[PDB]
Structure formats: structure tokens, C-alpha cells
Amino acid sequence: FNFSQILPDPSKPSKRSFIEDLLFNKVTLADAGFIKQYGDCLDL
């Protein structure tokens, strides 16, 4: 039973799996306030 697609990949720096990487790619998420956007503002 192959599990490399759903087990996390050490090649990825953000250690999500391959299918998790495709899931994060397909869901369009704004940068929002996790980077705080503060010096960039000082765009929806």
C-alpha cells in the first residue's frame, strides 16, 4: 500500500504532503493578516 502522496514530504520546506500541497494550491486564500500586511499598506 503506497503512502508517499499523503505522508509528509521532507523535500517540501513547509512539510505538507503532495496531496496536501495540491489542496493548498487549489484553495485560493488571501495573505490577509498572517503577514500583517502593515508595512506594505503603510489591495483589498
Partner: protein
């Protein structure tokens, strides 16, 4: 107030935002176009242990870089109660903000 790369039309005088507020202006004395960005603000969250145990307090300033916060006294409305933390002896930068 900063310099703006936005170029108005000759009959244009003001540039406006999504919420129908002024964002870009034309200076009356010299015909150059500026842009308005409102001044910095953010949330303040107070981290404390139990009052039964101690009285020391850490303070987190939310959403603001640490380049401003240890010099963000600026004669604030609420500065004499965070004045030792507006000085910033211990400064840490998180994704939540300046701690």
C-alpha cells in the same frame, strides 16, 4: 501624506477609495498629486499570569511591526499606562505583532 505615482487628469482633483473616502489629493500650492494613508493603529492584548501568583505583565501589540512600537509613545491617549512597555526593553516580533 506621501508622493503618489497615480497621475490625475487635468480636470481631476481627488482620488477616492472603495468606501467613498478620499485617498489621493492634488496639492493647491504646487500641482503635484499626493496619496493619503491613515496613521498606524492596532490591537493590544495583555498577557498575565494569575493575580494570586504574581503581578508581572507582558503586552502584545497586534498587527504592527517592531520598527515603530518601541518608539510609538508619540504622546498617545493611553501612553502613561504602557509607558514602560512603550519604551521596549524586551522586544519580540511575532506574526501576531510586536510582543
Amino acid at each position: 501624506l506621501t508622493e503618489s505615482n497615480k497621475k490625475f487628469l487635468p480636470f481631476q482633483q481627488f482620488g477616492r477609495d472603495i468606501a467613498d473616502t478620499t485617498d489621493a489629493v492634488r496639492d493647491p500650492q504646487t500641482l503635484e498629486i499626493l496619496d493619503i494613508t491613515p496613521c498606524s493603529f492596532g490591537g493590544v492584548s495583555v498577557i498575565t499570569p494569575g493575580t494570586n501568583t504574581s503581578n508581572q505583565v507582558a503586552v502584545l501589540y497586534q498587527g504592527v511591526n517592531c520598527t515603530e512600537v518601541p518608539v510609538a509613545i508619540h504622546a498617545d491617549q493611553l501612553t502613561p499606562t504602557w509607558r514602560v512597555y512603550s519604551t521596549g526593553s524586551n522586544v519580540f516580533q511575532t506574526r501576531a505583532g510586536c510582543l
